[PDB]
Every structure is written in structure tokens, then in C-alpha cells.
Amino acid sequence: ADTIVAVELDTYPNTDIGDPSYPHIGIDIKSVRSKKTAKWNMQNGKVGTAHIIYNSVDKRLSAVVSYPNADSATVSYDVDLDNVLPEWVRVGLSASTGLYKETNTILSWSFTSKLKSNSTHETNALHFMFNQFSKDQKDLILQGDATTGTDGNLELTRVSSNGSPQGSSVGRALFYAPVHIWESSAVVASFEATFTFLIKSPDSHPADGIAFFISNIDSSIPSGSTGRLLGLFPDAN
Amino acid sequence: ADTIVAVELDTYPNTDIGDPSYPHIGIDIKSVRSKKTAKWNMQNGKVGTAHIIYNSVDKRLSAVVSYPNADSATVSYDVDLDNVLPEWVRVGLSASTGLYKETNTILSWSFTSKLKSNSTHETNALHFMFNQFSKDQKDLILQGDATTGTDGNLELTRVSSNGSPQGSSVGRALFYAPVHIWESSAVVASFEATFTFLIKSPDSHPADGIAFFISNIDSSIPSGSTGRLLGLFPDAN
Amino acid sequence: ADTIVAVELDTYPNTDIGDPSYPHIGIDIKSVRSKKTAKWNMQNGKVGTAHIIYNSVDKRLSAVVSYPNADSATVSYDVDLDNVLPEWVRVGLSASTGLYKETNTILSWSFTSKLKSNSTHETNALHFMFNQFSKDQKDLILQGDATTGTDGNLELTRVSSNGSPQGSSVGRALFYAPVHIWESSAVVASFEATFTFLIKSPDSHPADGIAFFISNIDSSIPSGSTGRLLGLFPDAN
Amino acid sequence: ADTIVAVELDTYPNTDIGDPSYPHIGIDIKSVRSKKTAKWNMQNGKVGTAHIIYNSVDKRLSAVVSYPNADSATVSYDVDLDNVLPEWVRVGLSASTGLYKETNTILSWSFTSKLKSNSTHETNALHFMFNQFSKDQKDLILQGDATTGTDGNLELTRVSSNGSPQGSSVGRALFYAPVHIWESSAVVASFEATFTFLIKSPDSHPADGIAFFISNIDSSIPSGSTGRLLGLFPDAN
Ligand SMILES: [Ca+2]
Ligand SMILES: [Ca+2]
Ligand SMILES: [Ca+2]
Ligand SMILES: [Ca+2]
Ligand SMILES: [Mn+2]
Ligand SMILES: [Mn+2]
Ligand SMILES: [Mn+2]
Ligand SMILES: [Mn+2]
């Protein structure tokens, strides 16, 4: 039902469904089986940063993930989003845990989209930036186990009182306002997203990951999408 | 019921309710009877621009209106918005006509709000800019007679096929996402709004005006607020 | 001597040096003989807009040129600017006329460059926007025949009192501050430039064109670069 | 000679020249004897943040300084900068030490100035943001003992190898490009500056302070302005 385009930070290798045998970043177009992936040297307990960029002229979705003092990981995929997504969409973050677990903490999130028309100086834009989340964040649609306010952070999946991450959890956060990514008179459409995250697990095998995604405006968590499905897909096809 | 703070571009002098005897700009705090006004040399048929600014440190709401090749008009009022408005609000534009009429056309509208916390680099922001409006503008809540899409503009009040403005009309447009204007750990909160408009009337006496406003998130057009009430207030108290 | 990367809006076809037989937009890497070009339906006397974009992840320089009510023209070229340009550069606009002529008027110009480091939230940026130019624009380095202030515009090449464009003219405008386009710890570097222009000629054959360019910081107009050389190259190799 | 407007973070009370008897923030208009001050609970060794704002409509220069987990300090002063400063100016940071000392480390610095003209959509802007400084920062004019690059920070005054601050030191950093703060057709001019700093001293009595300042473009450090004069004034009048 839902149309999903996402950049996944996959912490657990499910080789039975196409994941490489190591943590990786990937670009998912309507399927959890990434169209392209790159090895990611994930660091348990460290704050990392992900940057996602795209523009309608080049038609290439690219993402870069890094941690301080370390080399980055990058992945790119040629795709025309006009042919995949509706004209109006919502953007958000999703995460899940299953048998294995980890905290999926978001410390900041910014997004900027621009539509440049052929009229002189005619440019439409939307920009939001969160460097702190409140208990009652009215401009976010929280789904599943996601909550905001703990230490000013956004916890996508369940975490107990003692800070311990729970398994079989799924949660998403979408920006309240729909986003216009295509318009008939637009000559250039582009967006850039950045978010900082903290994945921590008491185990040697963290799971399952975090994903930045773009979807139809009325998207909701598919049934049974905990674990390897990242709260984004109904199955592994 | 609704809590309204607005900057009015009042084209018709209703001296019976406190308006000066000439077109004017004014700052309205919960009442159509402006707390402060300034003479405005309105130009029928010309595109004008309004700028509104405010910050929590100075606690002064100021507005400047101008037309190309002409001197500007300015008005300021000392007011602490924390004591007037809720923590979360919606921002929008409103306009009305009555016995007398005019077109209340909006050609562009931008808004920027920032909340700077005491945490290092911790800053929250929201920014939107419309330089063109679509027939189906999903990020705007249109109320009353307001419509978008005609020539890429936002028509706040009714206009016939031949471009002729109708009387007894009222319409408003609010940005879809709620806006956070106060937070317990914020050291500075501020906003700036800019919109360009085209007020045109076939008559020597245009009415009633356009207003930029901030209100509780669930605000709706009060009954009988056409004409002198600008689609904002239930009465003239 | 100078290292030049430029996007040319070439109005005169010099087929003897590789130009296609029609006005065109092209990407020039250290040579006036464009690495790639696209047909451009230039409109004499109309205000057009050019958008240039690039990022270090995709390594693709793309440009889009358009006029109101018309289809756009686009050109892209895969090039790693790190391998062509110095770490610090200046950005500017250049134009020329020769035997044939045209006005090379710039009405607005904006530029944004960003360097995102691997440190958390660590981002460096520079942004400038001119929608009007003054007689004494201290933040611009004017070279050759370029002047600012006439009607608030930037005239890159000589125009007489009666508004008539002169031949054999060359002029450039560079932003005063050097721009940092590469840094050892940067994970993503990108820039976007936009400018609106008005090319008008009394003749059926306008020449020679306008170019947005990036160069070493101490770049100056090469001798004899009027005409087909666009004020950028010392010869046609 | 120089014309200086500055916001001082004064760490040492020189009661003989008008300082209150405690660390304080103040607004200086052409004199080290602040026109207005506010008590500042300075924290040795902690990273603080200063925000400075001003606009031509309200004509009020305000500043807010804070540290994480602490209440802020604010100071405001009504002043028309058009009557004090030239049309073109440079903005920068200055610091000094004398008999007493401290490190005057700047970790980030951002600035935004805007000039809104009465022409439709006509807006000029300049924005820069440094979250990291390089050894060779070509867009900064360093004066005196100021250096960049150590740990990616800007050290305004001398610090030895072991990280120990030196006395009798003075240094300033100015952004390379001049800034336009007034224009004949501007209806609103405004600026906002933010910088984060780390003042650390091995002594119970740190000195002398850091100041954000605006000056004539060719400003240089006055002779003998170490110590209480903050590298800004030639004497204490
Ligand atoms: Ca997986
Ligand atoms: Ca009235
Ligand atoms: Ca040519
Ligand atoms: Ca002192
Ligand atoms: Mn995967
Ligand atoms: Mn009124
Ligand atoms: Mn060519
Ligand atoms: Mn003092």
C-alpha cells in the first residue's frame, strides 16, 4: 500500500534477505532489499551523523554517514523520484528492534526542500530544524513506540527506565506538514536532510537499524514490521 | 474564544470603532480596536510589501509596509507575547469585504521563527516561503472564501470570473504546521514574516483590509466577522 | 595562468572553435571549448534565470537556464572540482562583446557554499544575495568595463547613455571574500548559484555571452579576451 | 580615529573606569565606559554562548549570554546605529589580557545581516558561519596575537604550548568582506550574531574579556589597548 523511499542505517546483517554480511547503509526503493549498499563501520555508543541529498536535475539520491575522528561511508543510487513518489509526501525517521536490540536515539534532525519555478525569483521552500525535542512536540506525528522529551531527545524505539533498549519495538516520527516535491512549472527540485543519532546496545549484536524515509502523506507502520523490516515494509519482497 | 494577535492593513476607516479617519496599519491585541496605528498611504492597484518582526528579548512587535518608489509606514507596540499567546500557535493571513469591497490578493508569503536554547548550538527553527500557490496547496489550511491557484496567487476573499471583487466576503489561510513560540529553556525566541499583496478596487472606497495574525492552533473564522472585523474578531469590543 | 571552471551562456556560435551552430549553454573546464553543451533558445530582451549546482559526493556540475513561460535548457558534466581547482577560490560573473554586441545586465545574484565536517553539527557556510547593486558596492571586485548602480543593476559590459551596448567590451564581478571549497575533514562540500540576467541587442546577432565562473583567488581578465573568449581565457585552445 | 560599537563580555572589574564590581556584559558605544551593563555570572572553564541582535526599526542593540544549565544574562540599549557607524563596516571579535589573564577561545561564530529595500522581493543579505577554523583561514583578517587552527579553534590571545594563557596579549579577527548596514532605499536593516567561547584561567581573577564589535572597515588595534581596553579603545575616556 504505502510507497516508501528510504536510506537505511542497517545494523544487523540478515543475509537471508540480501543484506551484506556486515552493518551497512543502503538505499531502499519500495523494498527492504536495498538497490545499493555500502559497508558501514558502525560504532556502538558513539554519536554519528547522516546526510542525505537529492535534486531533480541529476536524479541521484546520495547519503553520507560519519562519526567524529573516522572515515565516512557513502552510497548513491540513480533514481528519478518523480516516477516513484507522489507530488506531496511526508518525510520522517523510523527504527526497529527484534530479537536483538539497540537504542535508536535521535539527537537532532534538519530538513530543507526547495522548488524553483521558471518565474523570475519564484522559489518555494520548507525548512525545519530540531536540536531538541519537547514532551509535547506538536509539529511531529509520532507512530508506534516513538516518544520525545527524554533528555530532550527523540527515542524511536522503547527504552526502559534504566536506559536499557527493548526488543520487538517499532516507532516512527514524521514532520507534520506535507512536503511538495514536484510541481509542473518547477525547473529544479531538491532536498537535503541531516540527522544525528546514538545507537547503543549492551549486546555484541545490535539490531535492527534506523532509516530516514519519504512516503505518501498518510503512511502508517505496516503490521509486523518490527525487526528486519525497519518499521517500513510489510514483508521482505 | 480565540486568542488573536494581528497586524492589520486597514483600508476602510470605521471611525465609530476607533479607526483613524484614513487608511492605516495597526497592531491588534485581542481586539479590533488597535493598540497603536500609523497613517498608511495605500495605493489602489499597486503591489505592496509588509514586514513584521518580533523577539522575546525586546518584546516589541513592529511592522513596516511599503510600495515601490514610495516612503514606508511603520508601527510598533511593546507587548510580551508570552503573556498573550499559548506556547503553540498557528500563523496566517486574513481578509474581508463588506458593503464596500476590494481584492485581497497575496502574491508571496514567507515566515521564519527561531527558538534558541541555552544548550550549546541548540537552536530550533521553522521557515517556509511561498512565491507561488497551487490549486491544491496541502500545507495551507484555507478557511471561508479563500482559494489558491488563480494565476498562482492566493485570493483571500471572493473574486468573480471577470476579476471583480465581491462584498460580504471573508477568508483566511493558515500554515498547516503549528509553530512553537515559547519553550522553558529558550533564551531568545523570534520571528519575522513578509508578504506581498495587491489590493484593487473599482470603487473610491475600498474595504476592509488584510491582516497577518497569530492565534491558538484551532482558530476558525468567528460568525459575522465579515466587513470591519477582518475575519478575526466576533465583535468590536 | 588562471584556473577557470565556468558555465557559459554563449549567445554567438563560433563554429570555428567548436561551438554548436546555435546559442547554447556549456560547461567549460580550463578551456573555452566546452566539455558539454546544450541548445539554448535565447530570448532577446527577456529576463532569464540561471541555476548552477554541485556537490563533492556526486561530482557533477549541473546548470539550468530558463525564461518565464518557456521550457528550460539543462547541461551536466561529471567532474571532480577537487582535482581542478585550489582549496580557496573566488566566484564571479563575466561577459564580453566583440564585433557583435549585446547588453550583459545582471539583476540579481545569490550564492551558497557549505562544507560539512565529520565533527557533530560542524558545518561551515557562506551565503550572499544581491537583488540590487549600489554605485559603491564594496563587497564586489569589479574588473574591466563592469559597473554597478545604473538602475540598481550590474552592467558587466559597456552600455552608452542611450542604453546602447558597445562592442569590444569585457567586464567581470567577483565576490570580495575568498570561498573555501575543500577541507581535509569535510564529508560533503556543495554550492548553488543563481543569477538573473537581461541580454538585449539591437542586432539579429547578439554576442558574446555571460558566464558564471570559479577561479584562483587572484584571477584577472586575460589580455585580448574580449569577444568569443568571454573575458575568461587567453586563447581558444 | 576608529569608530567602535561593541558588546563586551568583561571578566575583570576595573571600578576605577566605571565597571561594576563583578564580571558583566555591556554595550559600548565609542567608549570602553559601557552605556549599559548587566551582571554576568561567568563560569571559568565552561563553554558559553553570546547572541547579539539589532534592527533599524526598533533601534535597540540587545545581547544575551548563557551557559548550559544556567540562567542567562541580558542587556539592551536604545541606539540608532545609522548615527554612529558608517554605511559600510567590518564585524569582528576582540580580546585581551593584561597583568591578569585567561584564554579567549572562540569555538564557533555566525553572522547574518539583511537589508530589505522597498522594491518588491528586493532583499540583500550576507551570512557566514564558522564551526571550525583552519590554519589558513583566508576569509578572516587576523590582527595582533590572534591565531586559528589549534584544535580547530580561534585563539584571540596568546596561549603557550601547555595551554597556558599569556598576559599582556591582544588579538582580533574580522570577517574579510565589508558589510553593508545602511542603504538609502532600505526599509528594514537588521543583523544577528552568535558566537561560542571558552574563557579559562588558572587564576581566581581572570582578565580581561572578549568583545564582539562593529567598526569602520579599516580598523586596526589601537596602541596600548591590551588589558582593560579590550583591544578596541586607545584610552579609557
Ligand atoms: Ca538488516
Ligand atoms: Ca476599518
Ligand atoms: Ca561563442
Ligand atoms: Ca574590565
Ligand atoms: Mn539492509
Ligand atoms: Mn483599524
Ligand atoms: Mn560556446
Ligand atoms: Mn566593562
Swiss-Prot record, chains A, B, C, D:
<dbReference type="Pfam" id="PF00139">
    <property type="entry name" value="Lectin_legB"/>
</dbReference>
<feature type="binding site">
    <location>
        <position position="10"/>
    </location>
    <ligand>
        <name>Mn(2+)</name>
    </ligand>
</feature>
<feature type="binding site">
    <location>
        <position position="24"/>
    </location>
    <ligand>
        <name>Mn(2+)</name>
    </ligand>
</feature>
<feature type="binding site">
    <location>
        <position position="12"/>
    </location>
    <ligand>
        <name>a carbohydrate</name>
    </ligand>
</feature>
<dbReference type="InterPro" id="IPR050258">
    <property type="entry name" value="Leguminous_Lectin"/>
</dbReference>
<protein>
    <recommendedName>
        <fullName>Concanavalin-Br</fullName>
    </recommendedName>
</protein>
<dbReference type="GO" id="GO:0046872">
    <property type="term" value="F:metal ion binding"/>
</dbReference>
<feature type="binding site">
    <location>
        <position position="208"/>
    </location>
    <ligand>
        <name>Ca(2+)</name>
    </ligand>
</feature>
<feature type="binding site">
    <location>
        <position position="10"/>
    </location>
    <ligand>
        <name>Ca(2+)</name>
    </ligand>
</feature>
<feature type="binding site">
    <location>
        <position position="228"/>
    </location>
    <ligand>
        <name>a carbohydrate</name>
    </ligand>
</feature>
<comment type="function">
    <text>Glucose/D-mannose specific lectin. Has anti-inflammatory activity in rats. Induces histamine release in mast cells from hamster and rat. Induces lymphocyte proliferation and IFNG production. Shows toxicity against the aquatic snail B.glabrata at concentrations higher than 20 ug/ml.</text>
</comment>
<dbReference type="InterPro" id="IPR019825">
    <property type="entry name" value="Lectin_legB_Mn/Ca_BS"/>
</dbReference>
<keyword id="KW-0465">Mannose-binding</keyword>
<dbReference type="GO" id="GO:0090729">
    <property type="term" value="F:toxin activity"/>
</dbReference>
<keyword id="KW-0800">Toxin</keyword>
<dbReference type="InterPro" id="IPR001220">
    <property type="entry name" value="Legume_lectin_dom"/>
</dbReference>
<feature type="binding site">
    <location>
        <position position="8"/>
    </location>
    <ligand>
        <name>Mn(2+)</name>
    </ligand>
</feature>
<comment type="subunit">
    <text>Homotetramer.</text>
</comment>
<dbReference type="InterPro" id="IPR000985">
    <property type="entry name" value="Lectin_LegA_CS"/>
</dbReference>
<feature type="binding site">
    <location>
        <position position="34"/>
    </location>
    <ligand>
        <name>Mn(2+)</name>
    </ligand>
</feature>
<feature type="binding site">
    <location>
        <position position="19"/>
    </location>
    <ligand>
        <name>Ca(2+)</name>
    </ligand>
</feature>
<feature type="binding site">
    <location>
        <position position="14"/>
    </location>
    <ligand>
        <name>Ca(2+)</name>
    </ligand>
</feature>
<keyword id="KW-0106">Calcium</keyword>
<dbReference type="GO" id="GO:0005537">
    <property type="term" value="F:D-mannose binding"/>
</dbReference>
<keyword id="KW-0430">Lectin</keyword>
<keyword id="KW-0464">Manganese</keyword>
<feature type="binding site">
    <location>
        <begin position="99"/>
        <end position="100"/>
    </location>
    <ligand>
        <name>a carbohydrate</name>
    </ligand>
</feature>
<feature type="binding site">
    <location>
        <position position="19"/>
    </location>
    <ligand>
        <name>Mn(2+)</name>
    </ligand>
</feature>
<comment type="similarity">
    <text>Belongs to the leguminous lectin family.</text>
</comment>
<feature type="binding site">
    <location>
        <position position="12"/>
    </location>
    <ligand>
        <name>Ca(2+)</name>
    </ligand>
</feature>
<keyword id="KW-0479">Metal-binding</keyword>
<dbReference type="InterPro" id="IPR013320">
    <property type="entry name" value="ConA-like_dom_sf"/>
</dbReference>
